[PDB]
Amino acid sequence: AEEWYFGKITRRESERLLLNPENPRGTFLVRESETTKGAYCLSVSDFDNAKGLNVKHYKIRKLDSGGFYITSRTQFSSLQQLVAYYSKHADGLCHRLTNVCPT
Template sequence: YSLSIRDLDHNTGEGVKHYRIRNMDNGGFYITAKISFSSLKELVQHHVRETDGLCTKLGKPCQSRAPQKPWWQDEWEIPRESLKLLRRLGAGQFGEVWMGEYNNDREVAIKKLKMGTMSVEAFLAEANMMKNLQHPRLVRLFAVVTQEP
């Protein structure tokens, strides 16, 4: 387990510090060897009251993001609005390839599927496979957009 704490660094601005929560042989947990806890809940409750080696006391939990779709192990889904199509590079049986920008600062190739040529499930299965492929002569998958225009 790990504990991540949002901490204000006066030199660089906001930051996050990570603490490893270690398991004890007898089933307990600890962050620093000087104090251990029988449960994770007990560890958290203690650090709400005391710093004991952390950068700060624990406050309210950070707001968590909505969970990704069950098939997705990582956060590969991006909003359609973050992409800008600049120039069409080519077209084929399943769609078009465009040169574009991601968040107005990263040049990317965008594969745009023709409607009805591939099911969403087949597209996602292909994307899931492609995210693990890495080779100097292959374009690396950066992200996917599944929402309809």
């Protein structure tokens, strides 16, 4: 874990941090999911000029066998490996992860 793990914040609170107009696109945080409890969520901010500033939530799921994934094709031993990969490149996501969300 580390700076980008926000724990048990709500989706409305994650969206209020991430939607701060200063945040570049790809600003992100990992948090617990409120609905599939047992899963996490990579919340990342995106921009397109039809909808403007908006957030995408990707459920991250944990294996019994330890690992974490957004796609069951692409699995990681930890949340830190996961975040690392998606910061090198987008591989299916809206945008590559760039900043850790502030505050």
